[PDB]
Write a protein that binds this ligand. Structure first.
Ligand SMILES: Cc1nc(/N=N/c2cc(S(=O)(=O)O)c3cc([N+](=O)[O-])cc(S(=O)(=O)O)c3c2)c(COP(=O)(O)O)c(C=O)c1O
Ligand SMILES: Cc1nc(/N=N/c2cc(S(=O)(=O)O)c3cc([N+](=O)[O-])cc(S(=O)(=O)O)c3c2)c(COP(=O)(O)O)c(C=O)c1O
Length: 476
């Protein structure tokens, strides 16, 4: 029955979503005071002692606004078609054909320590026997799977949440921001896993010679990835603001068509992709609202869809500007896409001003670093949280010290209301401490020493010498 607009978006029904969480999973590693400008867990609502801010619902409405903004322009249809053929073609020539996913495999693949979403909103593990969903979720899972096998449509219902994560302090103590998560319903997760699990698996296997890098290991795969990029003359590393909310469904639809066409049960996959990209029903608590545009997350094959969309858009811009055919562009370039993160290396003479304009024309908001700049060295180019570094031995991804120290101050634990509480006792995190030494080692012995000290100090409440970890971490 209900009508109107919530955060600029049409209301379609009453909502069933539980209330937004007021707790964080972050705990300080020490009771001492935080260094100034330190990152902290994002805002926790009216109950947050650190600051008096608006309601979580208001913070969520802020995040929903960009979804009602006008879309940018679709790329010129001929470029769009050639690019999409060229990307599909590239995948046909590289991906290993997969057998269908079983219902059993699909259910196994899901993360069992997160919510089931609409309508039970229970942690998946609570109806999971080890090998099958039973009880309530078993009924949802079974129904969804029957619909899948019958090629019948089902309207996903997403549940909005806000992301508990560390953030720069201005997002707590200034203008408060917190990231919108889209939380899928178990049924949609099942259908999506069955439909697209094969493609995603096939794609992960090619993460070194195909540009969708999802599933890569920074440590083991990065040096080969980065060495490939280095073979090309110009390097650029666009950063994008609000990638997800600025997507066009029409482009996501072209990405999806490629996924469907490269899946083992394409007729079944088609029904699922059409449900995923049909106007989206999102439960914000009081209301379920309809979101026609942007990317709907928590798919969970979304990161692939998104990366694929990114590949389409970047390539469309490049082709529009250089006028080189998309296949030849892939001969003369090396891409890395990981959702919204990009690295483009190319031999082509690319007009950076025109490239920036074409992306802005599509609705995207490219930004780096302080139009897009291109460099003749990969040194310093950013990828995920790393800086790409090269030396006599080769290339690697070095985590910035910011993130390193940040991991020294904060640890994960059970949800609580006050993030400045420390956990009692240990400090049960030896693996991370070592990895941190590793990450610190790549910064040189001077820095490694500092970090070694703190790591030792904390490990009190085997820490190797520098040259041995550095060797283990780069080569090992
Ligand atoms: C400090 C810390 N780091 C976490 N993971 N961060 C990731 C996590 C991943 S993940 O392998 O996709 O989970 C990262 C992956 C890539 N990658 O190029 O494939 C790169 C990076 S990055 O160091 O360059 O940013 C990745 C960083 C995580 C995520 O761990 P989890 O949810 O898998 O258990 C946690 C949470 O436990 C955490 O406390
Ligand atoms: C690039 C990349 N990074 C991921 N995790 N990022 C996190 C994620 C976390 S998390 O909030 O514990 O999930 C990080 C936590 C801390 N921390 O000091 O507690 C530090 C860091 S860091 O800035 O040093 O790298 C954390 C980094 C993740 C993990 O994201 P997700 O499991 O929450 O969905 C992925 C997922 O595939 C990913 O692809």
């Amino acid at each position: 029955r209900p009508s109107g607009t919530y955060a600029g978006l049409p209301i379609a029904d009453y909502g069933d979503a539980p209330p937004l969480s007021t707790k964080t999973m972050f705990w300080r590693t020490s009771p001492e005071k935080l260094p100034p400008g330190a990152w902290e867990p994002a805002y926790l609502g009216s109950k947050d002692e650190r600051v008096d801010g608006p309601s979580l619902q208001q913070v969520m409405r802020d995040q929903l606004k960009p979804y009602s903004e006008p879309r940018g322009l679709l790329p010129p249809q001929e470029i769009l078609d050639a690019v999409c053929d060229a990307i599909e073609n590239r995948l046909e020539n590289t991906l290993e054909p997969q057998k269908p996913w079983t219902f059993k495999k699909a259910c196994e693949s899901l993360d069992k320590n997160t919510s089931s979403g609409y309508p039970y909103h229970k942690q998946k593990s609570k109806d999971w026997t080890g090998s099958a969903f039973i009880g309530d979720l078993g009924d949802q899972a079974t129904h969804a799977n029957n619909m899948y096998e019958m090629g019948k449509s089902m309207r996903p219902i997403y549940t909005a949440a806000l992301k508990d994560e560390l953030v720069k302090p201005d997002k707590i103590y200034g203008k408060i921001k917190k990231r919108l998560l889209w939380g899928s319903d178990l049924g949609t997760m099942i259908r999506a896993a069955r439909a697209f699990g094969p493609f995603c698996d096939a794609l992960k296997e090619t993460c070194i010679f195909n540009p969708i890098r999802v599933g890569m290991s920074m440590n083991e795969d990065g040096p080969f990835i980065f060495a490939r990029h280095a073979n090309f003359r110009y390097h650029m590393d666009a950063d994008y603001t609000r990638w997800d909310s600025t997507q066009q469904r029409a482009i996501l639809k072209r990405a999806g068509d490629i996924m469907v066409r490269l899946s083992p049960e394409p007729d079944l996959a088609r029904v699922v992709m059409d449900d995923l990209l049909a106007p989206s029903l999102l439960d914000v608590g009081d209301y379920k609202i309809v979101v026609e545009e942007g990317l709907p997350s928590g798919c969970p094959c979304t990161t692939q869809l998104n990366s694929l969309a990114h590949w389409i858009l970047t390539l469309c811009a490049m082709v529009e500007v250089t006028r080189v055919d998309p296949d030849i562009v892939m001969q003369e370039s090396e891409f890395s896409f990981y959702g919204d993160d990009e690295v483009v290396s190319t031999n082509l003479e690319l007009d950076m001003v025109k490239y920036t304009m074409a992306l802005r024309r599509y609705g995207l908001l490219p930004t780096r670093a302080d139009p897009l700049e291109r460099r003749q060295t990969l040194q310093g180019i950013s990828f995920l949280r790393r800086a790409i570094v090269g030396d006599q031995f080769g290339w690697y991804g070095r985590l910035d010290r910011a993130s390193i120290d940040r991991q020294l101050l904060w640890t994960k634990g059970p949800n609580h209301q006050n993030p400045f509480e420390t956990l009692p006792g240990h400090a049960q995190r030896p693996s991370q401490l070592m990895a941190l030494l590793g990450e610190a080692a790549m910064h040189g012995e001077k820095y490694y020493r500092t970090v070694a000290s703190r790591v030792s100090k904390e490990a009190a409440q085997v820490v190797p010498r520098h040259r041995s970890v550095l060797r283990w971490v780069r080569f090992g």
